[PDB]
Amino acid sequence: VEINLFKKYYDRGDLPIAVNFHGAHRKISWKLEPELLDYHLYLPIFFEGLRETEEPYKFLADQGCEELLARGGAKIFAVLPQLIIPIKKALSTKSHPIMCTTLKKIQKLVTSSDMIGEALVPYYRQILPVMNMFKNKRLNIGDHIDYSQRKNENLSDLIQETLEILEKYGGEDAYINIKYMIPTYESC
Amino acid sequence: VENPYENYRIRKCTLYYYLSDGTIHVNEPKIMNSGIEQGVFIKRQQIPKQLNSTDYYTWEDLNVGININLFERVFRIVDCDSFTKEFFVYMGKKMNSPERVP
Amino acid sequence: MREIVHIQGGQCGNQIGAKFWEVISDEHGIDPTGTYHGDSDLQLERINVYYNEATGGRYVPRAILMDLEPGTMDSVRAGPFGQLFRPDNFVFGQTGAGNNWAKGHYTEGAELIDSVLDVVRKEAEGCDCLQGFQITHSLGGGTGSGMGTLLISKVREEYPDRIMETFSVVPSPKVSDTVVEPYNATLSVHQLVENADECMVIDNEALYDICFRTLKLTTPTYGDLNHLVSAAMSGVTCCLRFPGQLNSDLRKLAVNLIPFPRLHFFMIGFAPLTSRGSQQYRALTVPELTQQMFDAKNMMCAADPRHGRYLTASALFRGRMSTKEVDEQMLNVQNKNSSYFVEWIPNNIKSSICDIPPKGLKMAVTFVGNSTAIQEMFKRVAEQFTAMFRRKAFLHWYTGEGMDEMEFTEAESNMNDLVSEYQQYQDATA
Amino acid sequence: SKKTILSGFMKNNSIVGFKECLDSQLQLKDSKSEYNDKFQSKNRIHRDTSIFHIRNKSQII
């Protein structure tokens, strides 16, 4: 697309969120209570925002997408089919900072509500492939301690824990499918 | 082999020869109540004297009562249409006497 | 034992077989009538691989000819060697797919494909020990694209443990024959990779380049190009029909050329190919044959072999020739191009030898190399596909047969996935 | 009568450069495969001890 779908949607004036931050660092106070909103029309739009790399659209997209799945309740399952093609583009940006942003969001998705991972298994051929790109590329420093663990920037470390979450809630069939995309994986 | 009633068959088939481009064509018309998938027999083309060769027929080769070689299958051209006789007489190559098909 | 059936479809696919059997029939000495007239006692040692037996002594290829329009189906028989087929095997509809994939995959083909599978099942169950099936279908034509692809998906569902083969011709850009070529190509690969065990691409462009340069014949004809694909057909299963030093069944070639499950695309070539006059002069020896084997021009696919790096390669030499000269030459070609051979798979060339030479030559070689260069072919097909789709041009036809616009987006993503991850192993190092 | 006889049914359905390869390269016996030349030769308890070394420069091949 010529322009990221997120930016055009926001400037119009239909997103229900604003910054209005007065506190320790920053915060978001939704113009309307979360429960009322419809997830079908909004939930995939936010996920389009993860790709954005120019402020403030980066964070303002990020904070919600973490927030939407936290208080979803049970309606989230309806949107699972709608979240495939957007997120596929998100991992293809090849940008180091983004993958850190989206990977946590996807990992937290499986644990948000019950009986969702079993639905996500069939779509493994879409989200698994890029995950193989950088599995082995990791820092090799040695004895000198790493000062950077505070914020998760290690691509190899972030991903490795990612699959573990996927298979534990994936179900019985989860293991076989994961191997067929990325071979080096070892069962857990 | 398996026929109780029969032991040898006959297919009634006619041969066309075009004078424009030395092409031969063989088609076996429909024989009613024959229960055989009948249609085009040999697609119109040029066929060689012996399989995988570089010698081609010339109309002066066909004639009634002689054996033509065509994909190792042996043909017995028996009858002449009304228009065939004149051309042979016009060009000047003898013509043979006909006989009814057994 | 370990015999294979053949089923062909589409005018492009059907025409391919109409010459393949003629070529294959000659090798064993099977004349058109089907009565034995062979010469070499070895001609009939292993006829069960491709031929059944019939009372009266006339042989019948294990071919199930399928096409959705009767115009061509009534043509293949009338040609030379055209009556080796059992007409009971024939199957066809009454309307015509009209180059409409949805028509050949959802509406029409679904109606007629019930019968087609029936004859296939009967032929498969008749063999002694089944090995695999081979297809000859063209991705540029609808019925072959849709009806041809759908057959594989089901067939794999009945025989999950048997091998499979597909001969496909994709449309190169320099020459075009179907305005809807881009659409049927993207959907086709979406289904051939997921089920086909082995598939190899041959392009119309390559035939025209190979024909106009080496043979230099001034007037190519559809009979000509079909000949080259004929020899390649027999270049992969020679050891299944005659004794050899290193037999390599169809399964054996499968294990040694597919590093990972999702890469099973191969590109083939043949040699020697000498001009009509210059044949009396060339020196036919292993050193001479080898050099023409890896040349860029001989290869059957539009992809330039050097634009990528060879992930793996295969070679099946024909006839009598010392192995040492075969073994030594393969190593030599593995260092003179040290950069082009991926470095994390040592000893990345496979060689097989067969002792019965194809009729018409004292020696021959068939090339099957998995060249990473194929990224060029799929990439450009994506370029043509994207342009025609963002304006929603020519899509109203498909949407009228129960299909939704969502499905096309899914297929496009899959193809980019294969292209994107196919180059993954090109840059990774040790 | 050199090139005027052209006809569509003749140009298209006549292979050009893919007919049988000219002679002097077909000289091979399809029935003779390796393991048949020597192992199946026959064998003999007594061998013909005769040997000869012709007084002409052996041909290089």
Added chain:
Amino acid sequence: MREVISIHVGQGGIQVGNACWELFCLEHGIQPDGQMPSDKTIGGGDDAFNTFFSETGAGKHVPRAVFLDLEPTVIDEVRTGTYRQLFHPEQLISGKEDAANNFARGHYTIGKEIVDLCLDRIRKLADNCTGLQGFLVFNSVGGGTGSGLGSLLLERLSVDYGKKSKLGFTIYPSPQVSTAVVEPYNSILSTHSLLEHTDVAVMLDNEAIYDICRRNLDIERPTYTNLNRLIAQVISSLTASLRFDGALNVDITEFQTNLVPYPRIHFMLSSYAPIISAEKAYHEQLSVAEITNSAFEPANMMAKCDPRHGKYMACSMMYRGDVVPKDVNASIATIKTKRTIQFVDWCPTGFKVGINYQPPTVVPGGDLAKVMRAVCMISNSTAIAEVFSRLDHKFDLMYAKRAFVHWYVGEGMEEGEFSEAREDLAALEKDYEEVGIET
């Protein structure tokens, strides 16, 4: 009363197995049909054919072998050729589907359906024998079915019979000239099978035997046919001590008791000489002294490893011809003098010497010419660690990215199976260096 039962598994085994019998068949006076000629009895004495054959009361004889394979084209050829009448028709077991170089196929998936029959045929031959000393197994590790069916038999035999000794002449891949593309994988797995079930196994890698042909035989277009014949003599060289007279005899159970220092180190690389054509074999005296040096010349090792890089543990090297014991004494002593062939510090005397009289015979239509004196060496050297190392490293590169793993894990073999094999070679590699250190 001394006999051995030969075993052939794998296309390479049969083809080499095919060659090994014409050499043994001719040297005893049996025509291709097996009927002893009415006249011209080339064989003095008696009981010679008993060493490998069994009398049928009158007429012909039966080879003591069972040919095992899964793809019938190679086996089917033998039943049609000129040796149709020799082998028993109900011991040439053949399968239906080729293993396709998939080791898991021939060890877990398909092999189980033919191993039972082969063992049954084995029992029949064992009962007929009286003093069974051991078995001989040929197989090419550069293939799946060869390793699979080959591995199972040794595993099966060791428990069915027990202390009976076994021997195996394997054929490993060349360091750089390779035929298959998965050869590294099946090597590491296969070596696991015969590292804990066999007493002795020799190395006859293909690449070296190519070299031996070029430098002496004067042939620039060798084929797989000539390679088998050279391996034929070594079979003849070692086994000839059992069926003929000897001034100093050596038995099969005499080799396993003098060549293997410990339960692990039982790989040895052999060599043969002289290998001289007819046009050049009669212009030199072929004195015994000069032949032995060629035995230890470093270019004629039949395994692609240079002995100079390591230590020597023991060489059990045989002789044949009109060799008199006095000549050898000087040769072995003279060889010890050289300064580029040094022995381990813990084996002051490490030579086992054997002598036999019947000369090697020249098969017609071959390459080797007629000679009086030849010596076959089967020596264990500390340098063999190179071949295991090099094949080990090739394993790592492909396995670091789990390439080709998916064609085995689907054949019933657990994923953890592959790793354990590495420890043994890794364990084995440290072993050679362990004994190598001077005390």
